[PDB]
Design a protein around this ligand. Structure first.
Ligand SMILES: Cc1cn([C@H]2C[C@H](O)[C@@H](COP(=O)(O)OP(=O)(O)O[C@H]3O[C@@H](C)[C@H](O)[C@@H](O)[C@H]3O)O2)c(=O)[nH]c1=O
Ligand SMILES: Cc1cn([C@H]2C[C@H](O)[C@@H](COP(=O)(O)OP(=O)(O)O[C@H]3O[C@@H](C)[C@H](O)[C@@H](O)[C@H]3O)O2)c(=O)[nH]c1=O
Lengths: 377, 382
């Protein structure tokens, strides 16, 4: 590799549109990708007043198929080469070489993934030079410390450089933990907001159901998402199956992402259910007694919180300022993260099988800042 | 296919041994010449310091077995198989193929770790050792060359690598550079004791530092595509912008050294020319002729080329990282805080224009000696 794909030029051209317009830069809107923070960004973008703002979604990585656009029926699907002034508009711009998109004088950009912010910050500079205006504010939806997605390398510093941008920029952090993490590292933004995690609305409908706990160890297994430390969990399970003589009493199930069943020893297997419907997931939560969900990141992630609120004893990990142990009594937070400790803790929890306290009420009781932000654009 | 296990932490099985003297055991991935770079050479240099009169010495290879040629650099060492249990004073044991095999570990075997997975194993051997021989845990000596979790994205490897720093048993850290030490201190890591050795100019290079210099319009680039910390692709992108925005760029030669790669077209018929890894002599000559340098190190560690370039009269572009800012180490060093292609290009244009040394606050780099003056103080603790 001699070049860096993520930062392929994001060419713009002038447009005669005169109203204020919000532009959401997202990698994709396909259902296949409608998870992570792409759905959260779309939820937040939905909040902005379509009465005071035209809305255009710019796809930077993946083009949709007819099916995907069904979720955006009110949106006019338009090519980069056209320059329509619709109120709602979707433009595919993943294939950018020698092509450009019409950027208006008062186009405001909302970034998501770090490379979308990277591009936005360069479009803003082009914009102010072209139209002879002071730089407009960028809205930056920060889902995680994205440099952490890479080892120390080019991508790492490029991703981080988007946080060191000195132009007008408003950060909206996913979770307060993430915000405080950024504050500690000394990053600066024109303004800072955040939205706290909130229990999945479907799941909340089952949180009061009666629970018939079984001897089930529920694992959040996502081999493809390194932050979830799938391989570390497997290694821990293997030691657990070997050192714990009552392990045969337990079922060990994996949910989140489909993978092959994994032999742990003693004929015991890690059984993958892949990604269940929220309904089935809810049912499985009610029956399960122990949970394992790791998140190598200041962000808390959702499954640990969901598991705790369904009466599971949950094994999770500290990271810097994050320690979920004081969020909820059901949460067990390991500081030393290795297979042996997870196994050991797991044996303790199993033995204790023969809820209580919560300091995260906000979770079951969020974009109230949207309007305060609308006044700033 | 899907990785279900973690290769770096394959079990490091030990068995009891009757050897009774004190013995130092160096855990290194390899001693092959092909790998005799990075910190493997530094660890061997430091291990060389320990008094062979007071200590038996065994080197345990954890990743790569040598070939007859490689062992030529260790002629005084008896090359022995894991299955044998000899009490030689100097010994090398290959232990990269470990499954169903063991290595004899004596009551008073002391371990010196290098790469994080070697420390990971050492810490587990120590536990096995104290249980087996009914003794309190022995001290581990940990030679820390960098914040090795940084070698990975947030993941299993990351936390495993870091877990070696959170080990609560007796452990002495020897940091490569004070910057690295302070970096660890800031993150709040704890060790039984802390030492460090400051960077010292390559002895061969020092022989040329006083030669007369005939500076040419050469931009010298530390290019190592395989070492991500050196941000090779970031540099290339920066060069491309530089070639496009700078109208006097045709006046300059742009050369890459460190690791062999194909020549890279930057535009305007200009190419990044790779010389691969030069001999220290040729490297020295090239340094004397060059006027501008680019050397990046995404890590608290300063790395050597930026320092070498500065002391040969080059204006050097490098990067800040956390507590590291080499700009106040030496006047020839230009440190960028915002690290992107545009800024590197812009800075590069400034430096070229200024072409139409002075101040140093890192004298330690070309002075004294005895950078391992702590060795004997450490020997008293084992
Ligand atoms: C393990 C599992 C999770 N899930 C859902 C429930 C979890 O909340 C969600 C976690 O996936 P993530 O990509 O980490 O986050 P997410 O963005 O998909 O989920 C979030 O959606 C928001 C709208 C809600 O307000 C949040 O509470 C949260 O549910 O996945 C399933 O549908 N089936 C499963 O088997
Ligand atoms: C660019 C270049 C560097 N080099 C050498 C000189 C640099 O010091 C060395 C830097 O590579 P690294 O793997 O980052 O570090 P290193 O471990 O290989 O080198 C260090 O070894 C210590 C024992 C010495 O005391 C130091 O002076 C230093 O040489 O590479 C060449 O031989 N040829 C080259 O073309």
């Amino acid at each position: 590799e001699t070049s860096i794909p993520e930062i392929t030029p994001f060419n713009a051209r002038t447009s005669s549109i005169k109203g204020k317009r919000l532009n959401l830069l997202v990698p994709s809107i396909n259902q296949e990708h409608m998870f992570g923070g792409i759905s959260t960004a779309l939820k937040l973008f939905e909040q902005f007043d379509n009465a005071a703002f035209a809305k255009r979604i710019i796809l930077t990585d993946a083009t949709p198929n007819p099916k995907d656009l069904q979720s955006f029926k009110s949106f006019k699907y338009v090519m980069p080469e056209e320059d329509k002034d619709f109120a709602l508009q979707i433009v595919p711009f993943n294939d950018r070489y020698n092509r450009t998109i019409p950027v208006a004088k008062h186009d405001i950009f909302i970034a998501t993934a770090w490379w979308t912010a990277y591009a936005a910050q360069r479009i803003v500079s082009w914009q102010s030079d072209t139209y002879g205006i002071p730089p407009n504010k960028i809205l930056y939806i920060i889902q995680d410390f994205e440099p952490g997605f890479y080892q120390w390398s080019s991508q790492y510093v490029l991703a981080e450089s988007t946080y060191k941008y000195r132009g007008p920029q408003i950060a909206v952090f996913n979770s307060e933990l993430l915000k405080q993490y950024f504050n500690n590292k000394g990053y600066n933004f024109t303004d800072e907001y955040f939205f706290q995690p909130k229990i999945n609305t479907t799941l909340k409908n089952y949180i009061n159901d009666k629970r018939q706990k079984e001897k089930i160890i529920l694992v959040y297994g996502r081999p493809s998402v390194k932050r979830n430390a799938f391989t570390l969990i497997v290694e821990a399970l293997k030691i657990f199956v070997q050192k714990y003589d009552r392990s045969n009493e337990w079922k060990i199930i994996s949910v989140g992402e489909k993978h092959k069943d994994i032999a742990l020893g003693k004929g015991i297997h890690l059984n993958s259910l892949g990604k269940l419907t929220l309904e089935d997931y809810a049912d499985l939560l009610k029956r399960s007694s122990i949970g394992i969900s790791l998140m190598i990141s200041p962000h808390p992630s959702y499954p640990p919180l969901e598991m705790a609120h369904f009466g599971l004893r949950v094994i999770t990990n500290k990271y810097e300022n994050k320690d979920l142990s004081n969020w909820h009594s059901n949460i067990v937070s390991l500081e030393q993260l290795n297979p042996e400790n997870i196994a050991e803790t797991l044996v303790e929890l199993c033995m204790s099988f023969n809820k209580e306290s919560s300091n995260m009420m906000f979770y079951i009781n969020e974009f109230s800042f949207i309007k305060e932000i609308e006044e700033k654009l």
